[PDB]
Amino acid sequence: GPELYHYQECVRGTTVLLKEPCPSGTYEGNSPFHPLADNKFALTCTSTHFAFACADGTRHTYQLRARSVSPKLFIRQEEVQQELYSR
């Protein structure tokens, strides 16, 4: 099916409350999955990427953009780099 790549930005260390895109879906990732109230899943805001495969077949990929203590940085190579142009 289609691959709907999504991204979410959160400060590195906190807990995101990602709204469940589709009922009864497959959580694809190494990150923790925690079904929260009102169809959500709590995740540690960090630089990772997971995916949500819905019963429809829709693949909703999910990038997590950990905003460090300095969410600007720009230390020679963008904010942090190696998460963008690492080749």
From Swiss-Prot:
All copies of the X4e domain together span 3-68
State the disulfide connectivity. C10-C45, C22-C54
This protein's GO cellular component annotations are:
host cell endoplasmic reticulum; host cell endoplasmic reticulum membrane; host cell endoplasmic reticulum-Golgi intermediate compartment membrane; host cell Golgi apparatus; host cell Golgi membrane; plasma membrane; virion membrane
Q: List keywords of the entry alphabetically.
A: Disulfide bond, G0/G1 host cell cycle checkpoint dysregulation by virus, Host endoplasmic reticulum, Host Golgi apparatus, Host membrane, Host-virus interaction, Inhibition of host innate immune response by virus, Inhibition of host tetherin by virus, Membrane, Modulation of host cell cycle by virus, Signal, Transmembrane, Transmembrane helix, Viral immunoevasion, Virion
Keyword flag Transmembrane: yes
Q: According to the UniProt topology, which residue ranges lie Virion surface?
A: 3-83
> Source organism's superkingdom?
Viruses
Membrane topology recorded in Swiss-Prot or TrEMBL: Single-pass membrane protein; Single-pass type I membrane protein
Give the protein's biological function.
Answer: Plays a role as antagonist of host tetherin (BST2), disrupting its antiviral effect. Acts by binding to BST2 thereby interfering with its glycosylation. May suppress small interfering RNA (siRNA). May bind to host ITGAL, thereby playing a role in attachment or modulation of leukocytes.
Q: What is known of its domains?
A: The di-lysine motif confers endoplasmic reticulum localization for type I membrane proteins.
Self-association and partners: Interacts with the spike glycoprotein. Interacts with M protein. Interacts with E protein. Interacts with the ORF3a protein. Interacts with human SGT. Interacts with host ITGAL. Interacts with host BST2.
Q: What is this protein called?
A: ORF7a protein
What species does this protein belong to?
A: Severe acute respiratory syndrome coronavirus (SARS-CoV)
Q: Which residues of the full protein are shown?
A: 16 to 99 of 122
